[PDB]
Each structure stands twice: as structure tokens, then as C-alpha cells.
């Protein structure tokens, strides 16, 4: 369950600071629940591989991102790590991608 979907960083309006006793507005890329299966472009090792070798992967990926659609990278497992931040984490994390 690893997806990509262009998303904004939740910049809220601060009208009642004392009201930020709210959930301190944490963000997190871990999904509450997966997206609607119909709105997801499924990708395979092989599919990604080919598109990339041909030098079309980025393009396609971008298009999907622009269309506000989702893309899942199935087949492979990936070790998953959990980190917490106090502020604006490293770009290599925010805009980090699931491949080299």
C-alpha cells in the first residue's frame, strides 16, 4: 500500500490560537483509509520498468499527478519507517519518492 498523489501542505488560519489545543494539527502521509479503487492507476514492477527504460515514466507519472489521480506501486514490499517532526521536514522526505 504505497501511493503517490500531489498534495498540499495544510496551512491553516489562526484566528483563535488557544483553539490550537486542537490536535495540534498533525499532518502525516499515512492514510486514514485507501483511496477509491477506481481512481487508482495500478503499477507493476515490469510496467514501471519499461516506461522508465523508455524514458516516459516521469511524463506519465506527472500526468497522473496533474489529473489529481492516484497511483499505487504494487508487487514490492518496502521497509517502512516512522518519523515525527516539529517543523518543515527535509524535502527528500516531503517530496520523497518510492524509487531511485
Amino acid at each position: 500500500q504505497v501511493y503517490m498523489h500531489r498534495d498540499m501542505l495544510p496551512e491553516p488560519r489562526l484566528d483563535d490560537i488557544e483553539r490550537f489545543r486542537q490536535e495540534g494539527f498533525y499532518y502525516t502521509n499515512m492514510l486514514e483509509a485507501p483511496p477509491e479503487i477506481d481512481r487508482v492507476v495500478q503499477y507493476t514492477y515490469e510496467i514501471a520498468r519499461l516506461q522508465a527504460n523508455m524514458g516516459q515514466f516521469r511524463a506519465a507519472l506527472r500526468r497522473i499527478m496533474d489529473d489529481d489521480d492516484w497511483v499505487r506501486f504494487g508487487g514490492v514490499l518496502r521497509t517502512v519507517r516512522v518519523k515525527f517532526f516539529d517543523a518543515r521536514p527535509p524535502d527528500d522526505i516531503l517530496q520523497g519518492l518510492p524509487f531511485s
Binding site: 503499477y43 507493476t44 519499461l50 497522473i64
Partner: protein, 349 residues
């Protein structure tokens, strides 16, 4: 030029291979799509993929085939969709010797261009005397004024001759003037029990003879008649006689549906419905051609362009099947749910 068509064919047939998701590509397919998609995306500037999986990628690829299909047929459909827009440079993508084509592709095109440019003998489809205004009751006697032997038509592939006792004569002229046959295959039988001018039953006695260009022919056997030889009938019998001559089939230099291998099946495939999208598309395409936009031409075509187009479209149809593209066209409003022959019937005007 044929080369172009062959390429375009190959490419579509290649995309057809992209059935499901998890699959391994055939060597050739790659060399082809690889090179092709490149030149295409090169002059088209469209984002076609080698292995689509989205829908937009699938559409993109479809549009590519569509562009090539049209280009091969030299068809400029014009403004038919808000989603698709025919790219003209596609023609250039195909004229490049750089895109390879299959053996099959070339042999198929060589076949088309081959026969489509010359003629040949072909078993015609319908009865010889189909384009006749007048017909007579079969078995009923009829002797035209001043004649001892009166031959006339009694069906689409049937003629009957009325002979007076001891009468004889040439019949050929009834056949001549119609079509332009090369060989007419006959078979004559004695009408053993026919109706007379009054309605009374009459027998035709054995011994009556039919001879072609001189030679006497048996009854009930097939005859290779050249249409020019003397079609002579004699009645040595001392009674009235009536004989039927049947055109089992004939051959001419007019194109039939057997001009190109299973052309029929293709045409069926092209004219087949599938869905509103496909339908209206296929229709809108043929409206640039001499072919009936949605109904199997009564008469089999005879020009390269026609045959070609059908073939291309037929393949593009299969491509459409595997790619499951989804887009709009001007004037096409699609209903979701199931299909049913019912809704399909209603589609054809």
C-alpha cells in the same frame, strides 16, 4: 505507399498484444512499438506510452492507432471529437523507412494492391436472370406468335423452352446482352408434366435433344457453355415439349466478396456495433469514404482504397476492443448499463 499502410497495420496489430496488465512482451513487438511510438511522439508531441495502464495512456495509444489508421487510408475526418484531434504529421511518421513491418502485413497489402489493380474470373453471387422485369409461370406452356420454339424466363436462374411437335431452334439470345459472362454453367431437364394454354396436363416425350455449338448434351449434367456457342434445341417427338435450362452459376470479371480472404468477416467486424462510441466513430470515419457508413454494402467494392480502409478499420476495431478507450464525439450520447441486441438495433438510424 503500400509500405505505409503495412506499417500502420503492424503497429495496430502490435498494440493489440497489450491485453492485460501482467504480461511479457514478444521481442518484435518491442522493436516495433519502441521505434514507432518514438517517431510518433516525436512529431506528434503526444504522450504515448510503451506500456499503458491508466486509461488516458490507453486512449493516447488508441488515438495513435486511429491517427495512423486514418493516415494509411488518407482520410481527414475533421472535427469529430473534443477529446481527439487528428494529427496530420502522422503520415510522416509512417513514410519513414525506419519503422519496420511484419511479413504478414506486407503479404496482406501485396494481396490487396495485387488483385485490386487487375481482374479475374469469379463465381458470381446471384442468379443470372436477376435483373429481369418480366417472369413467367414455371411449367406453363407459352408459344409466342409465329414461333415453333419459344424460350422465356421463369425465374432468377431459370428459363423454359416451348417446342411444337417436330420443332427446333437456337436459344442463346435470351442469355446474351445481360452482364458479361465468361462461362455459364448449365443443366437442362425435360418438363415431364407441364400445363397447356388451357390448363390441361401434357407430357414431354423422351428423345428431345439440346446441343451446344453442335455437340449433343445429356440432360441433368452440368455444361460448360461459353455463351457464344449455338444453344440448339430439337423436338423430334410427335407431341408438344417443354424443357428447362438452368444457370447453376456463372463466372465473370466482376469483384465478389471472395476477392480477398474472409473479407466478409472483416466487413462484419467493421460494421458491428460494440458501443455508441465505436459505432458513431466508425460511422463518422466512413462518411469520408464511398462505403456505407453503417450497413454492409450491397455490392462488394472493387478499389484499393475501399478494401484497404475496411481492413484497417477492422483491425482498429480489435484494437478498440483491447484498449477499452473512453472518450466523447460530437452527437454521441452513450447509455451506461448492459448492452442488449435491443439497444444495438436502435443504433442503426
Amino acid at each position: 505507399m503500400d509500405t505505409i499502410a503495412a506499417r500502420a497495420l503492424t503497429v495496430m496489430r502490435a498494440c493489440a498484444t497489450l491485453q492485460e496488465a501482467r504480461i511479457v512482451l514478444e521481442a518484435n513487438v518491442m522493436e516495433i512499438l519502441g521505434i514507432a511510438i518514438n517517431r510518433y511522439n516525436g512529431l506528434t508531441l503526444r504522450g504515448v506510452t510503451m506500456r499503458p495502464t491508466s486509461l488516458a495512456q490507453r486512449n493516447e495509444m488508441f488515438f495513435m492507432c486511429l491517427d495512423m489508421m486514418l493516415s494509411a487510408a488518407g482520410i481527414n475526418v475533421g472535427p469529430i471529437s473534443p477529446d481527439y484531434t487528428q494529427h496530420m504529421a502522422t503520415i510522416g511518421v509512417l513514410a519513414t523507412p525506419e519503422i519496420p513491418f511484419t511479413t504478414e502485413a506486407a503479404n496482406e497489402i501485396a494481396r490487396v494492391t495485387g488483385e485490386t489493380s487487375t481482374w479475374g474470373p469469379a463465381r458470381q453471387p446471384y442468379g443470372f436472370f436477376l435483373e429481369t422485369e418480366e417472369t413467367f409461370q414455371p411449367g406453363r406452356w407459352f408459344m409466342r406468335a409465329a414461333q415453333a420454339a419459344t424460350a422465356v424466363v421463369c425465374g432468377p436462374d431459370m428459363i423454359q423452352v416451348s417446342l411444337n411437335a417436330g420443332a427446333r431452334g437456337d436459344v442463346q439470345q435470351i442469355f446474351q446482352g445481360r452482364n458479361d459472362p465468361m462461362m455459364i454453367y448449365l443443366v437442362w431437364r425435360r418438363i415431364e408434366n407441364f400445363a397447356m394454354a388451357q390448363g390441361n396436363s401434357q407430357q414431354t416425350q423422351a428423345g428431345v435433344t439440346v446441343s451446344v455449338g453442335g455437340v449433343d448434351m445429356r440432360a441433368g449434367r452440368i455444361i460448360a457453355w461459353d455463351g457464344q456457342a449455338a444453344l440448339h434445341v430439337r423436338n423430334p417427338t410427335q407431341q408438344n415439349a417443354m424443357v428447362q435450362i438452368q444457370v447453376v452459376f456463372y463466372i465473370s470479371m466482376d469483384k465478389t466478396l471472395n476477392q480477398y480472404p474472409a473479407l466478409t468477416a472483416e466487413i462484419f467486424n467493421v460494421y458491428s456495433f460494440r458501443d455508441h462510441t465505436w459505432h458513431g466513430l466508425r460511422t463518422a470515419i466512413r462518411n469520408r469514404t464511398t462505403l456505407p457508413n453503417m450497413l454492409p454494402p450491397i455490392f462488394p467494392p472493387n478499389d484499393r482504397d475501399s478494401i484497404l480502409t475496411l481492413l484497417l478499420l477492422s483491425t482498429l476495431a480489435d484494437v478498440y476492443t483491447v484498449l477499452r478507450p473512453e472518450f466523447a464525439m460530437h452527437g454521441v450520447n452513450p447509455m451506461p448499463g448492459p448492452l442488449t441486441a435491443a439497444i444495438a438495433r436502435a443504433a442503426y438510424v
